[PDB]
Amino acid sequence: LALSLTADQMVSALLDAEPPILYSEYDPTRPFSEASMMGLLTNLADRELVHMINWAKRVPGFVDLTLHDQVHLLECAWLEILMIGLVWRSMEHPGKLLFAPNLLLDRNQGKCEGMVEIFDMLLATSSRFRMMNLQGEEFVCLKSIILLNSGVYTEKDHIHRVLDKITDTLIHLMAKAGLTLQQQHQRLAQLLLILSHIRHMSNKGMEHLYSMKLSDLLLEMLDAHR
């Protein structure tokens, strides 16, 4: 199969497969209503989805899966992939969430309608990546893990095989960073444990999106969850 790349070739493929950072149809001269954020973040998530699909195709091993499996993995993990992408680019913005280069929000308009909690959780997640100095090479690996793991149950144990290769890729970065074996695998745990919270934020945002009920593609993703 294709999964023979060394850990450094793995990092290169993921780094080059990165989607772009899109902009928002945002008007700073206009105020922020509950529906304004609802409309802005919806259109931005919708235009990001088409990039995520093409990014997912460039993830090593994702092409080897059937169309039904690729649909399933993306239907369960897409909001996690937006969120950890959101959390990643908000790292150098303490106290703020950088939804887009022009859409930088804080814990004041984040309350603009249901549920703030996710907002602080995303902030704390971004604060978590900041305090531990998450490197881009480590971010692209975790984002790949989310795509493959969230729907491994929700044949194909090669998904586990690719997951094993991403794990090998991750500690390969940390070893080439002066981190002792103890500091190495406990770092690995801190990263994988954060993926639990991102799953939680996504499920909370998922059921919220179903309550406030947009994009035709976004509605196809909501029908998978319940």
């Binding site: 088409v50 699909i53 195709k57 169309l67 649909v71 593609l217 196809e220 993703m221």
Partner: peptide, 9 residues
């Protein structure tokens, strides 16, 4: 599904 087509392009 719109998702099925985008993966097929």
């Amino acid at each position: 599904k719109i998702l099925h087509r985008l993966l097929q392009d």
